[PDB]
Ligand binder design. Structure first.
Ligand SMILES: [Mg+2]
Ligand SMILES: [Mg+2]
Ligand SMILES: [Mg+2]
Ligand SMILES: [Mg+2]
Ligand SMILES: [Mg+2]
Ligand SMILES: [Mg+2]
Ligand SMILES: [Mg+2]
Ligand SMILES: [Mg+2]
Ligand SMILES: [Mg+2]
Ligand SMILES: [Mg+2]
Ligand SMILES: [Mg+2]
Ligand SMILES: [Mg+2]
Ligand SMILES: [Mg+2]
Ligand SMILES: [Mg+2]
Ligand SMILES: [Mg+2]
Ligand SMILES: [Mg+2]
Ligand SMILES: [Mg+2]
Ligand SMILES: [Mg+2]
Ligand SMILES: [Mg+2]
Ligand SMILES: [Mg+2]
Ligand SMILES: [Mg+2]
Ligand SMILES: [Mg+2]
Ligand SMILES: [Mg+2]
Ligand SMILES: [Mg+2]
Ligand SMILES: [Mg+2]
Ligand SMILES: [Mg+2]
Ligand SMILES: [Mg+2]
Ligand SMILES: [Mg+2]
Ligand SMILES: [Mg+2]
Ligand SMILES: [Mg+2]
Ligand SMILES: [Mg+2]
Ligand SMILES: [Mg+2]
Ligand SMILES: [Mg+2]
Ligand SMILES: [Mg+2]
Ligand SMILES: [Mg+2]
Ligand SMILES: [Mg+2]
Ligand SMILES: [Mg+2]
Ligand SMILES: [Mg+2]
Ligand SMILES: [Mg+2]
Ligand SMILES: [Mg+2]
Ligand SMILES: [Mg+2]
Ligand SMILES: [Mg+2]
Ligand SMILES: [Mg+2]
Ligand SMILES: [Mg+2]
Ligand SMILES: [Mg+2]
Ligand SMILES: [Mg+2]
Ligand SMILES: [Mg+2]
Ligand SMILES: [Mg+2]
Ligand SMILES: [Mg+2]
Ligand SMILES: [Mg+2]
Ligand SMILES: [Mg+2]
Ligand SMILES: [Mg+2]
Ligand SMILES: [Mg+2]
Ligand SMILES: [Mg+2]
Ligand SMILES: [Mg+2]
Ligand SMILES: [Mg+2]
Ligand SMILES: [Mg+2]
Ligand SMILES: [Mg+2]
Ligand SMILES: [Mg+2]
Ligand SMILES: [Mg+2]
Ligand SMILES: [Mg+2]
Ligand SMILES: [Mg+2]
Ligand SMILES: [Zn+2]
Lengths: 116, 54, 122, 213, 37, 112
RNA sequence: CAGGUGGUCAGGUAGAGCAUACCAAGGCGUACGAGAUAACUAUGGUUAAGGAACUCGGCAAAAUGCCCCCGUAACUUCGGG
RNA sequence: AAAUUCCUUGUCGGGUAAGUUCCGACCUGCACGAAUGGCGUAACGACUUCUCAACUGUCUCAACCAUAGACUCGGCGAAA
RNA sequence: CUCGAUGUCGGCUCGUCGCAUCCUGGGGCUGGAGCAGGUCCCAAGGGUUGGGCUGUUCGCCCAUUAAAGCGGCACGCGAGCUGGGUUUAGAACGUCGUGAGACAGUUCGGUCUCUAUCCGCCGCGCGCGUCAGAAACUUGAGGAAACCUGUCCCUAGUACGAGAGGACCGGGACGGACGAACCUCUGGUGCACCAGUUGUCCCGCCAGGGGCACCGCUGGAUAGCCACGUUCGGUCAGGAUAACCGCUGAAAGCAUCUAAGCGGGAAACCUUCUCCAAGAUCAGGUUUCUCACCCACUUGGUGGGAUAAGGCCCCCCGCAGAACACGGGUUCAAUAGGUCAGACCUGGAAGCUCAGUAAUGGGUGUAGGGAACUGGUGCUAACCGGCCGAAAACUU
């Protein structure tokens, strides 16, 4: 989606891609994850485009997601229930709830999860 | 560059009093039948019970 | 755009095959020579036994540039080489024929002879 | 009789004149303006006409400003700015509530366009004032974009006011003068002003008749 | 006009006058026209 | 679509043939040599389409006299009465910039 | 504590190689973090046209770069170059 | 006319569009000179110096991108 | 003055000032026919090039130019840069000295620290004030910025000149340099775009992909930012004037620009153009909105409480941005994201299938993928909220 304006998360752009892939995997595996608020905001459009591929559901879309995520089990979970359960919802697959900042660095924290 | 002279009390204090903590906006919430006071940005989490109230 | 210490190949038959832009004439501190700008140049190498000898300070007009030039109609002209032709103080070429294509911008700068003997004008 | 219109910069494009010449044009939607107020020399001390431009939801305007609009007897607008006129024969033609529109300007007329130039943030001295900077090499130590000297010596033991230094560029009121109006189409309230116009695509601009002609 | 701190008549028809706080000589010959400064 | 398509629409022309980078075309351009208003052909391979509607430009290249020449025209420029595709080109890039360092048979484009 | 510290072992693919790139075994993420497109500095990268015009000076950078096959000047101390 | 020449950017020639530097000479050597070696010399040089080709952000004349800082927030918290 | 340290030349960067003016502007005289000049006067608004040599300043030269001005500011400027020269320690030559050594003699090498406290400057906020509290639009006291110029054509080969040569004054066209805005074009960039590709490791394998190797490399590349790009400006007209040219006109029957008086008169000055601007504490103007209560005391231009208009903080964002500020939006919502559709970029996906021994090629199929640009969409987040914040009168 829309490229990061400013320094990318974790330092480099490559570390950015790794972070978004790993958080998308965790989000699809657990339904709900806690991360820093900037990471949650960066995840949201990335994860929703993955769900959009899952809703399309074709082998090409499978390969498109698999191009980004490496976990076969999570990609299977995506295309087996996450996509189908969002099939009748037009975008807005995720939700960010702002939670209390974490001690040690006062990093603002957020929960990101799938809508239902 | 080094300080040429020590600041006076007045000048030091005039600068130093401006180092203060930003006040957090607090609103009242009622979850689980009990009243509490939380920052406004955390109201959603407070209603979802995601905020450890201590 | 051609500036001082730029080498242009010579698109005529005066003998010079490469000249070095000395000044871009047409004003104080003028920087670049586009198509049809007049240059004073030194001949950096010429054919052996040629009319125009190495180390000669000559006047030349730029007739093709590798930097693309806008025409007023929004089109652009681009060549693969920077080339000039040595001219006399009356803007006629010192040589007797022009090699290679020539930018049409020389027509409205009154290089009419050069236009006439150019192989084809764009 | 200097004329003016409040509009929005919609971006640029090219067209071609009758002479088959390309013409870069900024299109400005000179949306209809209402007057809402006349400034008179004997009551305000100067001659001007307010112009209101831009649809806004009436709930979005505070009641001190809605009161001004309703005393003018017009629907509240989003932008409001005065066009300053000469000192005589000021309001013989502008009535509060009259709807002045793009074809107040004519084809081939010359306009002055005022806008708020695009923000540039805190800008260095090269970008902000065109300083040459320093060499990229030959020993230059960490001064490649730095201003260099900023004053003299013991005389004067200070740096003069107006010394060009780093600071915020942009967001300045800027007027470009004598821009040709290639075309005004009355069908949809847009003028095609030849050249560049200051500010964002979407920003408010005031198009006045060029007094330099 | 000759501008010198020393102005004196050159020929017999050089009128030497003082106008606007400064002295000068005016003459039929304009080469003799000459002003103190 | 774009916000300025309404300004765009009248300045466009139909009857501009479909053509792609790698195609060789004849571009007939009107040229004013005094008060003659003649038509000059420019025969060359299309090396670029740089899109955008009225602002779309296209660059075609040839080798006139030992010198490569590139002409960039606005499509929908009224200075071109019409373009004709003399051969369809088969390339696998969109901008064919490599031919500006190739001369001779090694700067050729196939016929599909 | 980005320095220093003698010796032993040291796999795979590519590679001439103990270079280098990615890996194995085996370790590690090493001890402030979280953000943020300011200037500016640093470290890298790209750059139209020109190509040393820079500068004390081509400093820095760029360029060249490998294997095989051709071919190779003045000069020479006959080895070279 | 030199790692030596003050006068001096000597003079002539070459190289450059233009050369106080460079090369070849002249000899008027302020103040060269034969083992504190003289004059040459293939090879060699992270030496000094001059030229050319190539190459380039060195420059014309800068622009943009990423990262580490700078900046903000939380913690610790100096210095001359 | 400074030795309990005031860093020395040149360059770079940034300037700023004077005018003894190089150009441009205005004039007088000329041994000024014209074109050009010479000289003097006025004039500092702007401009005043790039190279070769040298450490250089200077100077000479090359090519230009309207012109390539001269000076000051610690021979402006090293807590801004450089470090070539000079001026430590090494070494050599010449020369001097028995020598150690020495030399405004030469030669090669040899250094550039500091996190900005104060003033100063460039920007940006917070507070208060501005006789009620606010919002919008504004005046302009006073500032800032800006101020360059060429060539050609017509006038006219006319005036002038014996000819050669060759105008003034006016009008037009096109430029150079500089500046500003902008991104349509051109061009650059492009670190979540597309494609190709090398090595390797991995996804069990094939296929298809992924990690890393500078973004691995390579070809492109929308947005944004930008210049090499685009557009515009530098004007005109007034006022008061400089040098200078006068009118009327005495003292001084004449005469005289002056003594009374009145004119003309330049890029200088002031208006005019652009921008800032009421902290302009003389804190302005035109409007519009709220314009309302409650409690207590030592009853007071009293304190509180509650509010109004309004605003702030919070939230969703922005092409606005260091923070802050600014701007937009917050469900009577298209603000961001998603999503759908376009635009554009890349360039023909995967799978299947056909041809080929295969590398590969064709069909499905202008494919697939995709950021910034545009519109639709109420799916996600902008929430079930806290804090600031309103008037004695009295004089004509
Ligand atoms: Mg970006
Ligand atoms: Mg990488
Ligand atoms: Mg910005
Ligand atoms: Mg420069
Ligand atoms: Mg630079
Ligand atoms: Mg340093
Ligand atoms: Mg540096
Ligand atoms: Mg005398
Ligand atoms: Mg006078
Ligand atoms: Mg296209
Ligand atoms: Mg250690
Ligand atoms: Mg290794
Ligand atoms: Mg960080
Ligand atoms: Mg380049
Ligand atoms: Mg190039
Ligand atoms: Mg070259
Ligand atoms: Mg040089
Ligand atoms: Mg060279
Ligand atoms: Mg130089
Ligand atoms: Mg080097
Ligand atoms: Mg290199
Ligand atoms: Mg050799
Ligand atoms: Mg020597
Ligand atoms: Mg000599
Ligand atoms: Mg010699
Ligand atoms: Mg001896
Ligand atoms: Mg010896
Ligand atoms: Mg050795
Ligand atoms: Mg950065
Ligand atoms: Mg801190
Ligand atoms: Mg002391
Ligand atoms: Mg003077
Ligand atoms: Mg004169
Ligand atoms: Mg000046
Ligand atoms: Mg002025
Ligand atoms: Mg040289
Ligand atoms: Mg000066
Ligand atoms: Mg000094
Ligand atoms: Mg000086
Ligand atoms: Mg210095
Ligand atoms: Mg200093
Ligand atoms: Mg002795
Ligand atoms: Mg000494
Ligand atoms: Mg030295
Ligand atoms: Mg500092
Ligand atoms: Mg004023
Ligand atoms: Mg003041
Ligand atoms: Mg600008
Ligand atoms: Mg665009
Ligand atoms: Mg482009
Ligand atoms: Mg991708
Ligand atoms: Mg495979
Ligand atoms: Mg790995
Ligand atoms: Mg672009
Ligand atoms: Mg005037
Ligand atoms: Mg204003
Ligand atoms: Mg006020
Ligand atoms: Mg706001
Ligand atoms: Mg789409
Ligand atoms: Mg088969
Ligand atoms: Mg196929
Ligand atoms: Mg196939
Ligand atoms: Zn006389």
């Amino acid at each position: 989606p829309k490229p990061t304006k400013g320094p990318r998360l974790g330092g480099s752009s490559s570390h950015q891609k790794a972070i978004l892939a790993n958080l998308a995997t965790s989000l699809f595996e657990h339904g709900r994850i806690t991360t820093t608020e900037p990471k949650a905001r960066a995840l949201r459009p990335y994860a929703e485009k993955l769900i959009t591929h899952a809703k399309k559901g074709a082998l090409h879309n499978r390969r498109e997601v698999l191009k980004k995520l490496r976990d076969k089990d999570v990609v299977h979970t995506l295309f087996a229930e996450i996509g189908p359960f969002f099939a009748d919802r037009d975008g807005g697959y995720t939700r960010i709830i702002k939670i209390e900042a974490r001690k040690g660095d006062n990093a603002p924290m957020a929960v990101i999860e799938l809508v239902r | 560059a080094v300080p040429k002279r020590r600041k006076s009390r007045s000048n030091t204090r005039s600068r130093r009093s401006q180092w203060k903590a930003a006040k957090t906006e607090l609103v009242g919430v009622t979850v689980a039948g009990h009243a509490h006071k939380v920052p406004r940005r955390l109201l959603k989490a407070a209603r979802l019970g995601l905020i450890d109230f201590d | 755009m051609i500036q001082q210490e730029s080498r242009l190949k010579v698109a005529d038959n005066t003998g010079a095959k490469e000249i070095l832009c000395i000044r871009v004439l047409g004003g104080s501190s003028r920087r670049y020579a586009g198509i049809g700008d007049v240059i004073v140049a030194t001949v950096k190498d010429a054919i052996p036994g040629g009319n125009v000898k190495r180390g000669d300070v000559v006047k030349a007009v730029v007739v093709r540039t590798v930097k693309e030039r806008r025409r007023p109609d929004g089109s652009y002209i681009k060549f693969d080489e920077n080339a000039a032709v040595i001219i006399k103080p009356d803007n006629d070429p010192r040589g007797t024929r022009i090699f290679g294509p020539v930018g049409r911008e020389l027509r409205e700068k009154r290089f009419m002879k050069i236009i006439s003997l150019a192989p084809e004008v764009l | 009789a200097r004329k003016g219109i409040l509009g929005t910069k919609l971006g640029m494009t090219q067209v071609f004149d009758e002479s088959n010449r390309v013409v870069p044009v900024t299109v400005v939607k000179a949306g209809p303006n209402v007057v809402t107020r006349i400034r008179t020399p004997e009551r305000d001390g100067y001659s001007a006409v307010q112009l209101a431009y831009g649809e806004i939801s009436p709930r979005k305007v505070n009641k001190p400003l809605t009161g001004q609009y309703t005393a003018a007897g017009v629907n509240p607008r989003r932008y409001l700015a005065e066009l300053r006129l000469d000192d005589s024969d000021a309001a013989t033609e502008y009535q509060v509530g009259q709807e002045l529109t793009a074809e107040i300007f004519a084809d081939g007329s010359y306009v002055d366009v005022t806008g708020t130039s695009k923000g540039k943030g805190f800008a260095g001295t090269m970008k902000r004032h065109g300083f040459r900077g320093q060499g990229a090499s030959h020993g230059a130590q960490a001064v490649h974009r730095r201003p260099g000297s900023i004053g003299g010596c013991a005389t004067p033991a200070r740096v003069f006011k107006g010394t060009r230094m780093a600071g915020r560029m942009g967001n300045d009121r800027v007027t470009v003068l004598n821009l040709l109006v290639h075309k005004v189409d009355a069908e949809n309230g847009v003028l095609l002003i030849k050249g560049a116009v200051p500010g964002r695509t979407g920003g408010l601009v005031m198009v006045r008749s060029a007094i330099k002609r | 006009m000759k501008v010198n701190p020393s102005v004196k008549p050159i020929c017999d028809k050089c009128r030497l006058i003082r106008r606007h706080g400064r002295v000068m000589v005016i003459c039929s010959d304009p080469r003799h026209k000459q002003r103190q400064g | 679509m774009n916000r300025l398509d309404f300004v765009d629409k009248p300045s466009l022309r139909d009857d501009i043939p479909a053509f792609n980078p790698g195609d060789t075309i004849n571009v007939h351009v009107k040229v004013i040599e005094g008060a003659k208003e003649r038509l000059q052909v420019f025969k060359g391979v299309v090396i670029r389409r740089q899109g955008g509607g009225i602002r779309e430009t296209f660059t075609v290249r040839k080798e006139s006299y030992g010198v490569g020449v590139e002409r960039t025209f606005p499509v929908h420029s009224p200075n071109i009465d019409h373009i004709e595709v003399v051969t369809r080109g088969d390339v696998r890039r969109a901008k064919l910039y490599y031919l500006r360092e190739l001369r001779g048979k090694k700067a050729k484009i196939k016929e599909k």
